[PDB]
Amino acid sequence: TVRKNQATLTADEKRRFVAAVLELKRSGRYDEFVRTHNEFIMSDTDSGERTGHRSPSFLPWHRRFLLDFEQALQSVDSSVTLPYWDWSADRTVRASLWAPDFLGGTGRSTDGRVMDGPFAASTGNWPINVRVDSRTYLRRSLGGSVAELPTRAEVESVLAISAYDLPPYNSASEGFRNHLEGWRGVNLHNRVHVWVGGQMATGVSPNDPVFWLHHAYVDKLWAEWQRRHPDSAYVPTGGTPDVVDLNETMKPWNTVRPADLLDHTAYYTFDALEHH
Amino acid sequence: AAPESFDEVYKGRRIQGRPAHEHGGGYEVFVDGVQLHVMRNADGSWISVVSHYDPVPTPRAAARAAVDELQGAPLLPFPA
Ligand SMILES: [Cu+2]
Ligand SMILES: [Cu+2]
Ligand SMILES: [Cu+2]
Ligand SMILES: [Cu+2]
């Protein structure tokens, strides 16, 4: 399974990815990923139990969540893998990601409604069901709520941080995980959510298919951090209240630990990953 | 200490806040009587589920960001 930069997909690969995503939606399987995600967004807290977000297990949790989704896509078309969006490189509304043959573009100015591409509400193929804002169409405002996506220099400054995470293991932490997540510092992953806008700015962000491509690139940046820091590893490593330690199992699966997810190559490789 | 309560009409929507599937949960916000899930971050900023990735300083600011997000639309209640 090779996860490819979205910018590099062939037209056949874009077609097959879109068709597989639309079939998971039609069959009812897609929306349960959205619902699981929002339940962890609302439950992960800085002063209580935290698993999917604002915590060291943000990275392995999303790695397993994306693997579950990729496996669902491969049950519809075994050739499909999750592409990744390098938003430090493909940083304008003109990127091919946002063309009508892939994810469609930004929302129109009055209501945020996406008007083109396969996920536009007018197609009848992308109802927004699991939602908090009651409107039922995909919305985006690319660049509307924050001026710029992160740059490669900003990504490199976060990749240089040697500690994986640090006490208190939450949104106040220094260290790599929280700078990648974006609650402190120049802000990588959270700012991308804000830049897309629409459902991507909410706890039901997996309503936009770009969610998966954003997280596939966040996941690639974890793999890049590990190659840069082969001497550094997941923390904490035992007996931490409310935080998933290295060898502790993680909800909702309960049958997998961060330790089982550190090495992505057990599951997929990237088109390119520079080596250490 | 919890933030103070508030009650105003913001952009034609009634927003209310008060000290009190999702977390437990020390402050409640409502938009036209529908409860909006909100959360406080360790640095004292706030977010809501409809503007989750963009911290703002106060629960009233989170309620106002939700009204801005909704563009007039009703809020749906959250599970539980
Ligand atoms: Cu998430
Ligand atoms: Cu995310
Ligand atoms: Cu070396
Ligand atoms: Cu809650």
Side-chain angles (χ1 to χ4, degrees), chain A residues 42-43 46 54 132-134 203, chain B residues 21 23 41-42 49 69 74 76:
Chain A
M42 292 186 285
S43 298
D46 280 333
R54 52 181 63 221
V132 184
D133 183 313
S134 63
Chain B
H21 309 261
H23 82 310
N41 296 319
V49 59
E69 197 281 340
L76 302 188

Side-chain angles (χ1 to χ4, degrees), chain A residues 42-43 45, chain B residues 21-27 35 37-39 78:
Chain A
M42 292 186 285
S43 298
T45 62
Chain B
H21 309 261
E22 26 98 6
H23 82 310
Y27 199 92
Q35 201 182 157
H37 194 273
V38 297
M39 172 188 289
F78 63 98

